[PDB]
């Protein structure tokens, strides 16, 4: 899955640490990803950087997988790719619909 090797896929951590660490990293785009327990794929933990007061709006998503080619994973409802990372790249170098889309891989 060459996912745990990227700059955002942790291990045995869980969105908890991702958020616990992402929410503490304070990086306008700090994100990670992990394969939950009952997940049919992997979940990404993203963390942006809000102006002020409002406070950061960190968030995570589960890269939904399908049965096409390539589109194998999707973190939205149309964003399907066979490369969570690419998908990540997509959710960063494209439109995106999640927390200011992917940006910075704060991979613990």
């Amino acid at each position: 899955n060459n996912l745990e090797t990227y700059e955002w896929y942790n291990k045995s951590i869980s969105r908890d640490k991702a958020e616990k660490l992402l929410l503490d990293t304070g990086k306008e785009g700090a994100f990670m990803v992990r394969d939950s327990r009952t997940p049919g794929t992997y979940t990404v933990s993203v963390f942006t950087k809000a102006i002020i007061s409002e406070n950061p709006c960190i968030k995570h998503y589960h890269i939904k997988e399908t049965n096409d080619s390539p589109k194998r994973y999707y973190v939205a409802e149309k964003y399907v790719f066979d490369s969570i990372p690419l998908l990540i790249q997509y959710h960063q170098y494209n439109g995106g619909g999640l927390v200011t889309r992917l940006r910075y891989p704060v991979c613990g």
Binding site: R15, S36, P39, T43, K59, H60, Y61, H62, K64, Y74, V75, A76, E77, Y79, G97, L98
Partner: peptide, 6 residues
């Protein structure tokens, strides 16, 4: 329901 539903 258990993961920020995109």
């Amino acid at each position: 329901a258990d993961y920020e539903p995109p």
